[PDB]
């Protein structure tokens, strides 16, 4: 439905308003695509953190976002070993298909250590997140469509079209119309 | 011919491969366009840097890249105050008017600290930025169309259309055809 | 230094490049003197305005131009009556003693229906307003010298000598030698 383009390095569609890079399982990042932190979506996410500690949540200003394909690696790997590889392939991502390699994603982590998951800080994300122009990627419910576990935590920077994808309820996937899903 | 959509914030062009940010003296950027420096751009660049150092040219490893509105308003005054308006309107421009507010620009400076001019770099730059996705954005002898006196020393990250940039010799507003020159 | 002569219903100067009317409050206009709008200021300020807009500023189409001697006494004595004589001595003007009976002035207005005084939008004004044959009249710092309270909004038409003017960092009263100050 979508027209998705082949950037050689990452796919991408054209949004309402801007260029929206696709990464998912079906839509890969290059081994070499290394674009790093984008810094307008930093900058949106520190905005983010701050209003969500004003608003009382213990939310660390620590955060995992940029992840390279060989951080990935690393990380899927250790997730290989220490739980096996069908856990690896259910909560983990492999190289080249996790959306951190886009510099746009963000996981949002708690002053405790852990990945936020308490039922009023991901409300707080869901009602909150497109102000900063970030969608919650992955929600519950539509795994069959984005092709990836549930992340509470987990923030796309999509910039202004965040607020119309918000109230749509939609995974970016149905709201553009690009396939996602498992790996195959 | 270029259809230069306003998008708010910036203007741009639909290049061969990309949207290409257009930034001059007839399509400012706004007071509140902020990106930061690109990282793919920052990471190109370390690489041209470092080429250049095996050339045998004494390159720094420092440059002049981003520079949000309020950096060129202070750097503008500076020119103002110091030399008089009318100097200042020909070596810097005026905020919202320079190309480093895209956070796609560097000017590239020597290990002595001054900006890069001696005449075997600067051809070095001719002869090999677009390698690393650059063109010498302001040549000497189009500074009528561009509407900026010549800078050997800068940089314009524009990805994979870099080399047909450079074959053509062409300013970018020839190139793509839209209008530069002095602001009105 | 300036030789200001009386033509009948107003005062000037003859400037570089063309004559200047002066309109001060110690060179009022005639009751009499009804000019309206000038129409090559007008061309020139809905050019600036446009400029302005693209930069980025809420600016509105609307703006405080001409006003006769008629409107400035009912202007005026608004004031007075609403804010008492004294405040409307500190910033309106009483009839013959406003330049925008000139038709050359004009009060630059944002969409919000307030008079501009934003830094940014007011530091456009002095950054480009000669471009396009205005000075930025009534300076903070000046008010001595022209008599008049700062209005970051307020465009004087001069013509080709803007350029040099505004270069000068001085009012008119100071660039061309003629006396300004309070009524008396
Ligand atoms: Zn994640
Ligand atoms: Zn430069
Ligand atoms: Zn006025």
Redesign the interface.
């Known amino acids: 439905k979508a027209e998705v383009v082949n950037?050689?390095d990452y796919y991408s569609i054209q949004g309402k308003?801007?260029?929206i890079i696709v990464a998912n399982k079906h839509y890969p990042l290059s081994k070499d695509y290394?674009?790093?932190?984008?810094?307008?979506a930093?900058?949106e996410l520190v905005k983010l953190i701050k209003a969500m500690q004003e608003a009382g949540f213990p939310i660390s200003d620590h955060y995992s976002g940029f992840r390279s394909y060989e951080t990935q690696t690393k990380l899927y790997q250790d997730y290989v070993n220490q739980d096996g590889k069908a856990a690896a392939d259910r909560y983990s991502a492999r190289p080249g298909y996790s959306e951190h390699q886009t510099?746009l994603a963000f996981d949002v982590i708690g002053t405790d250590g852990d990945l936020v998951t308490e039922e009023k800080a991901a409300q707080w994300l869901l009602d909150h997140a497109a102000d900063y122009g970030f969608v919650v990627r992955y929600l519950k419910g539509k795994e069959k469509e984005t092709g990836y576990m549930a992340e509470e935590w987990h923030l796309r920077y999509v910039g202004?079209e965040a607020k119309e994808i918000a109230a749509s309820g939609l995974s970016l996937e149905e709201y553009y119309g690009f396939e996602g899903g498992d790996y195959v």
Chains 1, 2, 3 share one sequence.
């Open positions: 950037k050689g308003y801007d260029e290394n674009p790093g932190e984008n810094p307008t930093k900058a510099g202004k």
